[PDB]
């Protein structure tokens, strides 16, 4: 009877002990596992009882490693990394990893044939070279996360290592079949059919199974067990069919399935995702520790008997050669990746050629060769060299990668993240100190030992020359302010993960730029990359065997989704840059003191803002329906994010527990899941629908009837001028289609479909502010001024039309004042807009044209009329913010400027 | 070659389909699984290919069910329930479940022997009864959670079902060995040794393994993989040794191990706990669905061939009989456990005798008997009757339990939980509406389709007669106010889960009481329980083979922990009642309008408060060191809870992401884990340690030296009077040991160690306010008033001694004023104290004896002196809260009452 319980339980215990002991040291814990296996091998060789309890797991069948261990390791490597970043980098990852592995394998094989004194064939040498080009990603990314360096390097290394592992597995299988089973014959047609099966139909089978699984899982809400069991059964069935089809080369199907499933954010709830990740992590951890123990035992028992000093010399030579050829291939193929438009730096390449740590895939393949060789010495040589190379890499490269990162300067921390962390932990410490001072004076806790409490309230704490000086300080100021603004926008819930990554990466790239602060052309490449052949295919299918007829409309949906996935990123990037520039425009005046410097800074910032807003406007013009769809998605996403923030704030006030927190977060996540299933092609609304969607027109059917019965459609062509400066306010416009340029006294702005021009001209009855000119063929809605006066005099409800118009223009006027006057550390544009939305407009007629100032209200803004105060005879003219010290506001009644105040109350 | 892939994959798919389809219906989804298995059995009987793909899993070895399925089901039943409540109910759960199951098994066996026409022995009948007396907890607790009834009933049902399952497994094993393997002989000594092995040494082995595992896991921080793998390997090794020892009756060891491990909140991380729970949930789910499929197949193929109408008649009779005998045994044994003190009600007794749903344990045992019987008809009869009873229970009892719950009136919701949910969802809706109004006027999102957004912002929405009328309304007001106050105290983070449960359960019990609102003795039974054997054992060991000498000090630690586990609950319960009573007393005055009624209510509430505070003080006097330890634990726990609340509030302001949220929450949880490992016996600190721990003395070593150089230690016996009303303030006291009663003009309070008497009489130099009398022999620290004046004149730093004394007495004075004036819905006592900690005493000598009023400061309290205002000639006398409308504060300089103001600002 085989005995396996003691070995596996002892391996679990040894893995735990070695994991805990060597966490602080930079050397990985797996070399300790190999050492323990070696000691156990000596003991089992010299003691028969330990041999009886060791040999059943130490020398297993090679099909255990080929059919159980290796698929688990490779699938966990695929399943434990980000998928969207891999998709964004695959165009270079594929070519780099595949051709680098091919050249490295061929060079190592040639070195084995011509330098090693063993009379090895070409197939044995190619098996040898495929074994020793198979890196380990998890150790490298653990080191990178521990050192806190850039994550783009981490995901690039992860993708390169996964492709290396897959190609090495395929090449090893192909040459093992030739070396150990020579009865099988090969022809050119059979070889090309085998390549077509392995490289094309395998991943296609995995893709199909993953798609069917995700389609089935979408129909299931709030069921973790069903999702977990269905995902695991689909994984097993994919592996099983691919296995009985392609032997060891059928791992690409489950690799593709893992990549597809890991990218799911709607059909699979986050708790299911974290359970599946921990499940596969534990399985791969067990396989790793078992493999290292048995390779230690077998190396000690068999390999070290038949080695000489020449084998050690060959080991050192091979260790030098693999690093040299890796550096050679990366240096040779770096210019080719540079010419394609997505290159890599020099420091990143230096880290890349050094972080090639070998792992358990090569050790498993060497164990397979050792089992299959039998009494031949080739298996012993394979195991000796593979174990030596693994030990040398884990001993040298793992310790020197942190040294190289420190020397090369990639270990620095980003300033906004450090500032946010420091502010959070200092706020935590101040709150804890306040709690301590509260507790020390308690009537009941007046007898405790306060030394323990004071020790336990501690956090882990995670001339033209001067002109050039101020201009470089201003450049640094814009860089850091843009960085913190983009971070705040992401934290509020505006920017997406990909959009935030692109924005901060471009900011880091452009920090060293001196000609321009932020180039609009890179952002243009970010959003103006549509028009790709999917769009032409969609047009062709629109202008265009019964199953083919049924399948034709089903590609329209998928190509619409493909266009949407890029339009959303482009819109997010452009909107984030616009909001960041608008936020930095306010704080840059207070801190920059040189008049000419701030003049040219404002000039370049303004012109960049006009270019990005114009480009976004024409981009919306080009693709209407997908634009409407992504705008709706963004609106509902922001609504859900603010609901989540409301839940968190209610938790922070001590009014709701984690049970109800999960209960309401589940409803929010369900709403998000049903949102992501919405159609991605909403047709553009008719102009009457947009007229019914005006902010100060909704809620009153008779108002919309009155407006639509007496409004006019006006069409304008290129270059037309609708209104000019100083003209009498003829009426209120509404841009319902096209782009329009509003410029004059000397500001500029570009307005699009859905905006209203002339609210202030109709309400306050002053002439036009600036000249409005044409850009495209614009259709607008026209309502005359006398029309609007009649409409104002008609409706007199509690939310009257005049009140709504004045509230809209009041928030519009008061947002810059509130933002500029209280631009503290943490006052963003959206926070100011929401705070003003919490306010209301005060009618002073009911208060006998007088107003008091309390302490509960936060802001009081004078927007129309002139404010007076008998106390010290204060006089304030609109538009201005009322000072905190004025306590009485008296107003006069005059027909030219009615007194209108906008106040904000607190909770 | 056996074929098992199609059957298991189809069972997974069928379980998913039946789970999703029958979620809304109250009938469980497992009857659909049995129906599908029956159809598959018919098809496989009539088609040879389906039989070939079915018979390998449909007819498995009985050792698969005995060694794999049943341990998994029983361990998951043990592992998936709260354990602390199981200890709190075990004293009745053990006797009720064990004796009820024994009587039910014997009655069912007698019914099988005498009524069924099958000539069955006594051992076969007892096997029958043990099979039919094994219930199922998961279905009934799912129904109870869906209907939202009380959770104590669910806990009782879970424990009763787990004991039923364990002892039914034991009885079935014992009688199966006699029925099917009669070569084994039995004697009295062998039987009693077998009982000693099964019932005593098995659970002891499980307890020992669980304790060693928890001790090993305590030494590992921030390692999920090591904890998960070590816990799972310990579970397997416990099961394996208990299995090879006691066959099927060795499941009690893993049941005990699961119960112990489920209690771990420090050594095992919450993420590890949720992973392990989901893991065992999935394993038990697979076992359940597989069992139901094979029981359907085998019932159709074999059982339904040898069944007549008499068998159906016997099935109905047995279904009536099992329910009748369950009701009979619960009604007979209800008075016995009612006389012990902890009884059960009538409605709960009616409900719990109906929720005896049979499940997969009895089905697995019937399948085992079917496999072992062979060609005999006894196995077919067992399977037929067990399947029929399972079907009848799942069809009748599961549908009628919700009807009985609705009729009996326990489906109601608690008022504070409903109010909290309603407030939270309405705040969410208001925030979403504000976000919608913000988005509809955006310059960029002015083209989206707003119907989708407006539809998607929706929440799931989860005469003496009149005198008696007002008194009953006042009783309802106290009940609701106490309930909401206890809930708020729990949510903030002082009340423990057990303490909150006890408090709300006693409130619900006492809601119908008319003699008293809350009985003090019912809580004395909650804190005064430690007059038991552990205290005397600790005393004996204190006043008291080398391993025995080393083990003697190690029982002191465990008995100290056992005392602490009850002292903490008592302190939490008493403190929660005290705080809730204070809050309701501060809030009941504005609500009640009858003067005599509120006078009597205040009198009775005050008397209750004095009794509970006196009892708590004497309890602290009884056990000093454990009391100091629990007070320190409570202080650090409150500090950590407020740090967690700070993290949540920072997230709710949109300044921190989930990654950094988990990063800092991990540090907080690590600090909590290292706090829970602290010693549970801190010796009482010396009196000088208390003298150096005063709130207005810390931070200045010279101050403590000056005080200690001229302080006096005063001893008093029972009945002594230290100060009386109207006496000149001789000095400042400090109670350093004992209890003291401060009563007079007509309030009354009880003070203990660590409190200071006479701060106001020294600071303001007015005579004493109330007479201070003695309760126990008190040691106090006395400092003369002249020495205090000298110390005041000596130290003149920025945080001067006079400033600290005035700040302490200022917060003490101003807490009731703020907590009474503006006690809205959501302002608790700790909230007022924490808000007041942010304030400061403002200095008017620097400000030329005049003070302005800002619009950002929240509270301004006049505490010393008289406040004046030339505007409208306002005059306010201390102590009073400054009205919101007063804008100017001017003060005069007079030696009798120096003007001291306490102001509060915001962030
Ligand atoms: C996915 C993750 C990774 C880690 C893991 O899961 C999680 O991977 C799993 C997987 O990998 C498992 C292994 C799969 C392969 C298994 C092989 C199995 O051995 C087989 O056991 C059979 C039953 O005992 C036969 O063995 C014969 O049994 C006879 C019984 O009387 C003996 O007689 C005779 O001797 C034995 O035969 C012996 O076995 C030899 C095998 O080469 C020869 O047959 C020879 O005869 C003799 O010497 C058979 O012959 C033998 O092969 C062994 O018992 C357990 C085994 C190793 C498993 C142990 C546990 C694992 C590692 C699991 C582990 C947790
Ligand atoms: C813990 C949760 C719950 C659910 C689950 O895990 C998670 O529980 C697990 C566990 O419970 C598993 C089962 C444990 C028991 C297993 C038994 C195994 O059958 C054995 O398979 C061996 C290898 O094939 C031998 O079978 C012989 O195979 C020869 C060819 O190799 C034939 O020739 C010969 O005929 C067969 O031998 C024949 O075996 C039969 C035995 O009755 C015949 O009747 C006859 O005798 C004998 O000639 C052996 O003989 C036979 O027994 C079967 O293949 C799979 C099996 C059922 C397992 C399927 C998967 C599970 C259910 C797992 C499942 C996921
Ligand atoms: C709490 C409980 C914990 C343990 C729970 C159970 C532990 C599991 C298993 C304990 C041992 C099972 C013995 C089964 C006997 C089968 C038999 O009669 O022989 C058969 C042959 O034998 C085989 O083919 C054996 C194959 C068994 C595989 C079981 C895998 C379970 C994995 C579980 C994964 C979860 C583990 C996660 C970590 C806990 C047939 O014999 P025949 O036809 O007569 O010829």
PDB file of C-alpha atoms in Angstrom, chain A residues 5 16 19 23 223-226 228-229 232 236 240 275 278-279 281-282 285 421 424-425 427-428 432 434-440 443-450 452-453 456 458 460 462 487 490-492 575 578 620 628 631-632 635-636 639 642-643 645-652 654 656-657 660 664 667 671 682 693 698 751 753-755 812 830 833-834 837-838 853-857 884 887, chain B residues 5 16 19 23 223-226 228-229 232 236 240 275 278-279 281-282 285 421 424 427-428 432 434-440 442-450 452-453 456 458 460 487 490-492 575 578 620 628 631-632 635-636 639 642-643 645-652 654 656-657 660 663-664 667 671 682 690 693-694 698 751 753-755 812 830 834 837-838 853-857 884 887:
ATOM      1  CA  UNK A   5      -0.066  11.032   4.083  1.00  0.00           C
ATOM      2  CA  UNK A  16       4.434  26.998   6.325  1.00  0.00           C
ATOM      3  CA  UNK A  19       7.294  30.728   4.413  1.00  0.00           C
ATOM      4  CA  UNK A  23       9.553  36.504   4.800  1.00  0.00           C
ATOM      5  CA  UNK A 223     -25.946  32.837  -6.027  1.00  0.00           C
ATOM      6  CA  UNK A 224     -22.297  32.318  -5.127  1.00  0.00           C
ATOM      7  CA  UNK A 225     -22.420  28.511  -4.987  1.00  0.00           C
ATOM      8  CA  UNK A 226     -23.916  28.110  -8.467  1.00  0.00           C
ATOM      9  CA  UNK A 228     -18.431  28.886  -8.236  1.00  0.00           C
ATOM     10  CA  UNK A 229     -19.428  25.322  -9.108  1.00  0.00           C
ATOM     11  CA  UNK A 232     -14.994  25.130 -11.722  1.00  0.00           C
ATOM     12  CA  UNK A 236     -12.340  20.997 -15.597  1.00  0.00           C
ATOM     13  CA  UNK A 240     -10.282  17.453 -19.934  1.00  0.00           C
ATOM     14  CA  UNK A 275     -12.892  32.888  -3.707  1.00  0.00           C
ATOM     15  CA  UNK A 278      -7.707  32.124  -3.376  1.00  0.00           C
ATOM     16  CA  UNK A 279      -8.731  28.594  -4.434  1.00  0.00           C
ATOM     17  CA  UNK A 281      -3.655  30.208  -5.336  1.00  0.00           C
ATOM     18  CA  UNK A 282      -3.819  27.454  -2.710  1.00  0.00           C
ATOM     19  CA  UNK A 285       0.992  26.678  -3.719  1.00  0.00           C
ATOM     20  CA  UNK A 421      -1.429  58.384   2.779  1.00  0.00           C
ATOM     21  CA  UNK A 424      -5.052  59.888   6.141  1.00  0.00           C
ATOM     22  CA  UNK A 425      -2.696  58.506   8.794  1.00  0.00           C
ATOM     23  CA  UNK A 427      -6.065  62.274  10.574  1.00  0.00           C
ATOM     24  CA  UNK A 428      -6.269  58.783  12.107  1.00  0.00           C
ATOM     25  CA  UNK A 432      -7.093  58.490  18.225  1.00  0.00           C
ATOM     26  CA  UNK A 434      -9.000  62.831  20.734  1.00  0.00           C
ATOM     27  CA  UNK A 435     -10.467  59.458  21.735  1.00  0.00           C
ATOM     28  CA  UNK A 436      -7.701  59.041  24.326  1.00  0.00           C
ATOM     29  CA  UNK A 437      -8.415  62.455  25.842  1.00  0.00           C
ATOM     30  CA  UNK A 438     -12.121  61.584  25.899  1.00  0.00           C
ATOM     31  CA  UNK A 439     -11.484  58.247  27.623  1.00  0.00           C
ATOM     32  CA  UNK A 440      -9.007  59.481  30.248  1.00  0.00           C
ATOM     33  CA  UNK A 443     -16.423  58.341  34.935  1.00  0.00           C
ATOM     34  CA  UNK A 444     -16.302  54.564  34.359  1.00  0.00           C
ATOM     35  CA  UNK A 445     -12.906  54.013  32.698  1.00  0.00           C
ATOM     36  CA  UNK A 446     -11.078  55.921  35.440  1.00  0.00           C
ATOM     37  CA  UNK A 447      -9.200  52.872  36.753  1.00  0.00           C
ATOM     38  CA  UNK A 448      -7.605  51.234  33.697  1.00  0.00           C
ATOM     39  CA  UNK A 449      -3.882  50.947  32.984  1.00  0.00           C
ATOM     40  CA  UNK A 450      -3.214  53.807  30.581  1.00  0.00           C
ATOM     41  CA  UNK A 452      -1.059  49.928  27.457  1.00  0.00           C
ATOM     42  CA  UNK A 453      -3.682  52.190  25.874  1.00  0.00           C
ATOM     43  CA  UNK A 456      -1.532  50.678  21.537  1.00  0.00           C
ATOM     44  CA  UNK A 458       0.149  53.841  17.349  1.00  0.00           C
ATOM     45  CA  UNK A 460       2.354  51.416  11.445  1.00  0.00           C
ATOM     46  CA  UNK A 462       3.138  53.079   5.891  1.00  0.00           C
ATOM     47  CA  UNK A 487      -6.166  61.395  -8.401  1.00  0.00           C
ATOM     48  CA  UNK A 490     -10.524  59.116  -9.812  1.00  0.00           C
ATOM     49  CA  UNK A 491     -11.294  58.856  -6.092  1.00  0.00           C
ATOM     50  CA  UNK A 492     -14.615  60.694  -6.425  1.00  0.00           C
ATOM     51  CA  UNK A 575     -13.190  64.740 -19.570  1.00  0.00           C
ATOM     52  CA  UNK A 578     -10.685  69.057 -18.964  1.00  0.00           C
ATOM     53  CA  UNK A 620     -19.143  63.194 -30.566  1.00  0.00           C
ATOM     54  CA  UNK A 628     -25.316  58.824 -26.437  1.00  0.00           C
ATOM     55  CA  UNK A 631     -22.940  59.312 -21.902  1.00  0.00           C
ATOM     56  CA  UNK A 632     -25.880  57.412 -20.391  1.00  0.00           C
ATOM     57  CA  UNK A 635     -24.331  59.232 -15.854  1.00  0.00           C
ATOM     58  CA  UNK A 636     -25.618  56.039 -14.244  1.00  0.00           C
ATOM     59  CA  UNK A 639     -25.018  58.008  -9.738  1.00  0.00           C
ATOM     60  CA  UNK A 642     -22.256  58.558  -5.295  1.00  0.00           C
ATOM     61  CA  UNK A 643     -24.714  56.069  -3.781  1.00  0.00           C
ATOM     62  CA  UNK A 645     -20.115  57.112  -1.211  1.00  0.00           C
ATOM     63  CA  UNK A 646     -23.356  57.810   0.671  1.00  0.00           C
ATOM     64  CA  UNK A 647     -23.199  54.282   2.122  1.00  0.00           C
ATOM     65  CA  UNK A 648     -19.580  54.805   3.196  1.00  0.00           C
ATOM     66  CA  UNK A 649     -20.341  58.197   4.754  1.00  0.00           C
ATOM     67  CA  UNK A 650     -23.310  56.743   6.647  1.00  0.00           C
ATOM     68  CA  UNK A 651     -20.978  54.032   7.950  1.00  0.00           C
ATOM     69  CA  UNK A 652     -18.432  56.654   9.013  1.00  0.00           C
ATOM     70  CA  UNK A 654     -21.732  55.299  13.186  1.00  0.00           C
ATOM     71  CA  UNK A 656     -25.161  51.518  10.079  1.00  0.00           C
ATOM     72  CA  UNK A 657     -23.441  48.167  10.629  1.00  0.00           C
ATOM     73  CA  UNK A 660     -26.740  46.339   6.462  1.00  0.00           C
ATOM     74  CA  UNK A 664     -27.270  47.735   0.550  1.00  0.00           C
ATOM     75  CA  UNK A 667     -28.357  46.112  -4.128  1.00  0.00           C
ATOM     76  CA  UNK A 671     -28.026  47.645 -10.106  1.00  0.00           C
ATOM     77  CA  UNK A 682     -29.125  54.183 -28.202  1.00  0.00           C
ATOM     78  CA  UNK A 693     -35.119  67.318 -21.298  1.00  0.00           C
ATOM     79  CA  UNK A 698     -39.002  69.245 -16.881  1.00  0.00           C
ATOM     80  CA  UNK A 751     -20.682  74.559 -27.044  1.00  0.00           C
ATOM     81  CA  UNK A 753     -25.744  69.708 -28.617  1.00  0.00           C
ATOM     82  CA  UNK A 754     -27.881  70.208 -25.518  1.00  0.00           C
ATOM     83  CA  UNK A 755     -26.580  73.599 -24.355  1.00  0.00           C
ATOM     84  CA  UNK A 812     -23.532  78.779 -12.625  1.00  0.00           C
ATOM     85  CA  UNK A 830     -17.761  68.352  -8.143  1.00  0.00           C
ATOM     86  CA  UNK A 833     -21.271  71.811  -7.478  1.00  0.00           C
ATOM     87  CA  UNK A 834     -22.947  69.340  -5.102  1.00  0.00           C
ATOM     88  CA  UNK A 837     -26.974  71.983  -5.313  1.00  0.00           C
ATOM     89  CA  UNK A 838     -27.765  71.529  -1.614  1.00  0.00           C
ATOM     90  CA  UNK A 853     -26.857  85.847   9.012  1.00  0.00           C
ATOM     91  CA  UNK A 854     -26.871  82.717  11.173  1.00  0.00           C
ATOM     92  CA  UNK A 855     -24.128  80.243  12.089  1.00  0.00           C
ATOM     93  CA  UNK A 856     -25.716  77.060  10.699  1.00  0.00           C
ATOM     94  CA  UNK A 857     -25.631  78.246   7.075  1.00  0.00           C
ATOM     95  CA  UNK A 884     -18.239  85.905   7.090  1.00  0.00           C
ATOM     96  CA  UNK A 887     -24.558  89.927   9.928  1.00  0.00           C
TER      97      UNK A 887
ATOM     98  CA  UNK B   5     -17.747  12.512 -15.549  1.00  0.00           C
ATOM     99  CA  UNK B  16     -27.777  24.994 -10.667  1.00  0.00           C
ATOM    100  CA  UNK B  19     -31.598  26.159  -7.540  1.00  0.00           C
ATOM    101  CA  UNK B  23     -35.781  30.258  -5.445  1.00  0.00           C
ATOM    102  CA  UNK B 223      -0.456  34.872   5.616  1.00  0.00           C
ATOM    103  CA  UNK B 224      -3.756  33.575   4.259  1.00  0.00           C
ATOM    104  CA  UNK B 225      -2.305  30.571   2.419  1.00  0.00           C
ATOM    105  CA  UNK B 226      -0.461  29.184   5.450  1.00  0.00           C
ATOM    106  CA  UNK B 228      -5.861  27.985   5.116  1.00  0.00           C
ATOM    107  CA  UNK B 229      -3.595  25.027   4.356  1.00  0.00           C
ATOM    108  CA  UNK B 232      -7.432  22.118   6.198  1.00  0.00           C
ATOM    109  CA  UNK B 236      -8.094  16.031   7.506  1.00  0.00           C
ATOM    110  CA  UNK B 240      -8.380  10.436   9.560  1.00  0.00           C
ATOM    111  CA  UNK B 275     -12.844  31.366   2.435  1.00  0.00           C
ATOM    112  CA  UNK B 278     -17.431  29.063   1.339  1.00  0.00           C
ATOM    113  CA  UNK B 279     -15.137  26.061   0.750  1.00  0.00           C
ATOM    114  CA  UNK B 281     -20.352  25.170   1.837  1.00  0.00           C
ATOM    115  CA  UNK B 282     -19.452  24.169  -1.726  1.00  0.00           C
ATOM    116  CA  UNK B 285     -23.571  21.374  -1.609  1.00  0.00           C
ATOM    117  CA  UNK B 421     -33.129  51.163   7.237  1.00  0.00           C
ATOM    118  CA  UNK B 424     -30.571  55.171   5.280  1.00  0.00           C
ATOM    119  CA  UNK B 427     -30.818  59.590   2.532  1.00  0.00           C
ATOM    120  CA  UNK B 428     -29.565  57.450  -0.372  1.00  0.00           C
ATOM    121  CA  UNK B 432     -29.215  60.242  -5.871  1.00  0.00           C
ATOM    122  CA  UNK B 434     -29.201  65.614  -5.977  1.00  0.00           C
ATOM    123  CA  UNK B 435     -26.732  63.820  -8.258  1.00  0.00           C
ATOM    124  CA  UNK B 436     -29.392  63.657 -10.984  1.00  0.00           C
ATOM    125  CA  UNK B 437     -30.089  67.385 -10.718  1.00  0.00           C
ATOM    126  CA  UNK B 438     -26.340  68.035 -10.857  1.00  0.00           C
ATOM    127  CA  UNK B 439     -25.893  65.853 -13.945  1.00  0.00           C
ATOM    128  CA  UNK B 440     -28.873  67.185 -15.918  1.00  0.00           C
ATOM    129  CA  UNK B 442     -23.749  69.437 -16.946  1.00  0.00           C
ATOM    130  CA  UNK B 443     -21.962  71.000 -19.906  1.00  0.00           C
ATOM    131  CA  UNK B 444     -20.689  67.613 -21.138  1.00  0.00           C
ATOM    132  CA  UNK B 445     -23.504  65.199 -20.217  1.00  0.00           C
ATOM    133  CA  UNK B 446     -26.127  67.358 -21.939  1.00  0.00           C
ATOM    134  CA  UNK B 447     -26.885  64.804 -24.674  1.00  0.00           C
ATOM    135  CA  UNK B 448     -27.526  61.526 -22.830  1.00  0.00           C
ATOM    136  CA  UNK B 449     -30.830  59.651 -22.672  1.00  0.00           C
ATOM    137  CA  UNK B 450     -32.254  60.646 -19.299  1.00  0.00           C
ATOM    138  CA  UNK B 452     -32.622  55.291 -18.501  1.00  0.00           C
ATOM    139  CA  UNK B 453     -30.835  57.335 -15.831  1.00  0.00           C
ATOM    140  CA  UNK B 456     -31.935  53.362 -12.874  1.00  0.00           C
ATOM    141  CA  UNK B 458     -34.253  53.425  -7.882  1.00  0.00           C
ATOM    142  CA  UNK B 460     -34.913  48.070  -3.861  1.00  0.00           C
ATOM    143  CA  UNK B 487     -28.753  50.141  18.958  1.00  0.00           C
ATOM    144  CA  UNK B 490     -23.760  49.133  19.558  1.00  0.00           C
ATOM    145  CA  UNK B 491     -23.329  50.812  16.165  1.00  0.00           C
ATOM    146  CA  UNK B 492     -20.862  53.371  17.525  1.00  0.00           C
ATOM    147  CA  UNK B 575     -22.396  50.318  30.968  1.00  0.00           C
ATOM    148  CA  UNK B 578     -26.329  53.192  32.177  1.00  0.00           C
ATOM    149  CA  UNK B 620     -15.339  46.101  40.592  1.00  0.00           C
ATOM    150  CA  UNK B 628      -8.402  46.611  35.472  1.00  0.00           C
ATOM    151  CA  UNK B 631     -11.199  48.247  31.447  1.00  0.00           C
ATOM    152  CA  UNK B 632      -7.908  48.404  29.526  1.00  0.00           C
ATOM    153  CA  UNK B 635     -10.394  51.417  26.183  1.00  0.00           C
ATOM    154  CA  UNK B 636      -8.189  49.992  23.433  1.00  0.00           C
ATOM    155  CA  UNK B 639      -9.852  53.447  20.270  1.00  0.00           C
ATOM    156  CA  UNK B 642     -13.031  54.943  16.354  1.00  0.00           C
ATOM    157  CA  UNK B 643      -9.998  54.487  14.088  1.00  0.00           C
ATOM    158  CA  UNK B 645     -14.886  54.844  11.884  1.00  0.00           C
ATOM    159  CA  UNK B 646     -12.295  57.433  10.830  1.00  0.00           C
ATOM    160  CA  UNK B 647     -11.301  55.181   7.913  1.00  0.00           C
ATOM    161  CA  UNK B 648     -14.947  54.782   6.881  1.00  0.00           C
ATOM    162  CA  UNK B 649     -15.625  58.526   7.109  1.00  0.00           C
ATOM    163  CA  UNK B 650     -12.498  59.290   5.071  1.00  0.00           C
ATOM    164  CA  UNK B 651     -13.761  56.866   2.421  1.00  0.00           C
ATOM    165  CA  UNK B 652     -17.182  58.536   2.469  1.00  0.00           C
ATOM    166  CA  UNK B 654     -14.040  60.550  -1.557  1.00  0.00           C
ATOM    167  CA  UNK B 656      -9.328  57.266  -0.200  1.00  0.00           C
ATOM    168  CA  UNK B 657      -9.705  54.168  -2.380  1.00  0.00           C
ATOM    169  CA  UNK B 660      -5.577  51.875   0.727  1.00  0.00           C
ATOM    170  CA  UNK B 663      -4.149  48.518   3.548  1.00  0.00           C
ATOM    171  CA  UNK B 664      -5.043  50.521   6.668  1.00  0.00           C
ATOM    172  CA  UNK B 667      -3.059  47.448  10.190  1.00  0.00           C
ATOM    173  CA  UNK B 671      -3.390  45.865  16.151  1.00  0.00           C
ATOM    174  CA  UNK B 682      -3.072  43.349  35.254  1.00  0.00           C
ATOM    175  CA  UNK B 690      -3.387  56.844  39.946  1.00  0.00           C
ATOM    176  CA  UNK B 693      -2.670  59.419  35.796  1.00  0.00           C
ATOM    177  CA  UNK B 694      -4.996  62.376  36.462  1.00  0.00           C
ATOM    178  CA  UNK B 698      -0.180  64.286  32.877  1.00  0.00           C
ATOM    179  CA  UNK B 751     -18.181  57.471  42.794  1.00  0.00           C
ATOM    180  CA  UNK B 753     -11.600  54.718  42.280  1.00  0.00           C
ATOM    181  CA  UNK B 754     -10.153  57.337  39.944  1.00  0.00           C
ATOM    182  CA  UNK B 755     -12.714  60.116  40.426  1.00  0.00           C
ATOM    183  CA  UNK B 812     -18.354  68.580  32.173  1.00  0.00           C
ATOM    184  CA  UNK B 830     -20.544  60.162  23.249  1.00  0.00           C
ATOM    185  CA  UNK B 834     -16.337  63.890  21.137  1.00  0.00           C
ATOM    186  CA  UNK B 837     -13.234  67.581  22.729  1.00  0.00           C
ATOM    187  CA  UNK B 838     -12.557  69.626  19.573  1.00  0.00           C
ATOM    188  CA  UNK B 853     -19.347  85.604  16.502  1.00  0.00           C
ATOM    189  CA  UNK B 854     -18.253  83.640  13.434  1.00  0.00           C
ATOM    190  CA  UNK B 855     -20.430  81.744  10.969  1.00  0.00           C
ATOM    191  CA  UNK B 856     -18.266  78.597  11.010  1.00  0.00           C
ATOM    192  CA  UNK B 857     -18.139  77.850  14.748  1.00  0.00           C
ATOM    193  CA  UNK B 884     -27.510  81.524  17.442  1.00  0.00           C
ATOM    194  CA  UNK B 887     -23.457  88.323  17.236  1.00  0.00           C
TER     195      UNK B 887
END
